[PDB]
Design a binder for this molecule. Structure first.
Ligand SMILES: [Mg+2]
Ligand SMILES: [Zn+2]
Length: 134
DNA sequence: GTACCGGACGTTGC
DNA sequence: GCAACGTCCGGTAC
């Protein structure tokens, strides 16, 4: 399908085959009207190791939106197992208040473990901010 | 190499 | 109310 982001109607872009590391592409709209994109990769150092979803594509996207003050965003990833239950329950925490970010798993995704979902999830950030690690 | 630990948030089962 | 459970993660004990 095609998802709306401001005035744009964007579909899923080409992503590398899932090798074991989840790679994703994140789209937003700049303070002018143009469409910008950034690639996020699983792993890497995170400022919140106390949140199990901070190392994921959805968590890195949420933290990016919080840092750069982005209100709307749209991310596509390539993980066939879907979006983990952590990213389901803690994204709105990580996300700044009233920020809208939809996470689109690859089409045809099949969850395996508990909490993982294969459908699109539209998160709405809550007034809660992430707890400091120390 | 395998096997756990662990913060943290909401869900499910009891 | 409480126990298990969820990583795309590192880190620690065998
Ligand atoms: Mg929040
Ligand atoms: Zn996740």
């Amino acid at each position: 399908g095609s998802y709306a982001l401001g005035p744009y109607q964007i579909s899923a872009p080409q992503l590398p085959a899932y090798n074991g590391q989840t790679v994703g592409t994140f789209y937003y709209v700049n303070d002018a009207g143009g469409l910008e994109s950034k690639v996020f990769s699983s792993g890497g150092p995170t400022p919140y190791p106390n949140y199990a979803n901070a190392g994921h594509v959805a968590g890195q996207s949420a933290l990016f939106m919080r840092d750069n003050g982005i209100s709307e965003g749209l991310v596509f990833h390539n993980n066939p197992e879907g979006t983990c239950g952590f990213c389901v329950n803690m994204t709105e925490t990580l996300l700044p208040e009233n920020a809208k970010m939809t996470v689109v798993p690859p089409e045809g995704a099949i969850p395996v473990k508990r909490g993982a979902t294969g459908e699109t999830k539209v998160f709405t950030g809550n007034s809660n901010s992430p707890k400091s690690p120390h």
